Amino acid sequence: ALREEAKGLFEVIPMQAPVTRDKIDLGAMLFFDPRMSKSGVFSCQSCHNVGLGGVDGLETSIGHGWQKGPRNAPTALNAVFNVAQFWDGRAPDLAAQAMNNTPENLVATVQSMPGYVEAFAKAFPGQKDPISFDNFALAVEAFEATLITPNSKFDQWLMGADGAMSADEKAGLKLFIDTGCAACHNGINIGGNGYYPFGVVEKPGRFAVTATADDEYVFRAGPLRNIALTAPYFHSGKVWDLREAVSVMANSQLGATLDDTQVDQITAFLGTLTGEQPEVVHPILPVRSAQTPRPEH
């Protein structure tokens, strides 16, 4: 019954997200290559650490031009299923929207390595110039599709394991749904679908939720899957305790009066969204050449 209701609001993470191999292998390399960053110190992996729930464990960091400022890095895990992929911005901008190393540099970098040259060859069989920014992205994309975490306790229960979750955890599921959370944090990723004119801020609880300066400016209701592994929380990454994050959100213009037990249960439910982490072998990155652009410095 509750499952019937839950089934109407969420989806489970599939065994595998919807060349292919060499396409993934190329992506893995690019994803783990720090030379793809202007400074040569950051690789996707650095901030979307596959060993840390696909995050960097820091309050904030900066790695994309679109970024509106230092933001808490979201997990790469299951990120492929997100329809809303940004933290914040003006609604119009974000709708049409969906650091330094220009596509020129990237292509050059990749271009400069024999390993990458043959790697792109395998990944894209009949192209005269398989080394193109677009393919570069597609490859990384392929790999990212690999970073999914199926079989979370929640997914198990959703599929029928009446005993996959505890009483409290189910109570948290009901309260989560009933309290209004699911209205923004839904979908296969329990979030990552839409933006809202709200953001959590620290006061000079130490944090509150306040409307954006303009209703047109919005923040993304992030995917809660694996959240137990992606601390700190909120765009600022200032709240480190999951229980408190649930709390600052429950007790706000967004949720409703919730008691300590109730809060505890929703957060208990949230821990239920941690899925089996991808086992990823660190790829052996191709050797650099004299033509390979040197790191920032």
Add this chain to the structure above:
Amino acid sequence: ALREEAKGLFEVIPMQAPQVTRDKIDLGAMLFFDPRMSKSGVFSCQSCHNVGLGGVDGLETSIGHGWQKGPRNAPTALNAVFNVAQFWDGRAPDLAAQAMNNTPENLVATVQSMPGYVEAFAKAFPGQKDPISFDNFALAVEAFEATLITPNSKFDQWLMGADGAMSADEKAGLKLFIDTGCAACHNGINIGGNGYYPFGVVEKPGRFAVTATADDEYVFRAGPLRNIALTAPYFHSGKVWDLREAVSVMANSQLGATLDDTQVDQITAFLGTLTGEQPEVVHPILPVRSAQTPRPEH
């Protein structure tokens, strides 16, 4: 014959270094890949000793150890366990006895604060009132590091009898390397990483040169050349990016001898012969943090 001579100056990398001994490696892997072991929470050993980048960070310099005398080019972790001289430079005396922020207190605390690390240390060290001690912490990391060895390089193969594992040029580079005097400092199982010398490559206001240190008391380590083809840039400053040039600035110095273009090319050709099979390493799943886990810097 040349092999007989080479066999007297170097050793091949073993299939496995001479090291629970599994639960220790696994624990080491985690610590090695855990960025929370750094004060700022952004650097893990892996960050600067990237197992995908010949165990280096690919930067001119970086800073990650208290003993460091200043920004230095990060050496590969690969085969590092076989090095007897493990520092870049310093005063001979200091270095003899000697062998960033997060104090051993913090580390132990950090590890201590995670249930995963607690059970991981348990498996790694079956007996102890507190298996979670800085010493064990190091021992575990050490265990893993012993895993980061690159055997079967073309050179090792040839040393083991494969007359055809190396090319003519590469063998010429081996003879030149030996004959020119390189092997005098760059020898051992790692073709270096054994001793320090009163010389350092400095950028001239070639564009670099081997200069004697201010005082012969102060010395720089003749680093291991294995996998060097993968560990650019070169020298303590990490200012030379081309291997061929590194060979050159060193050949054309008091440490080397007069080598022409082909000779230099051959020595550098030989050096590429030291790249061994890279360790296939699965990125470990780091244990989750707790409320007691020290928060990152900032």
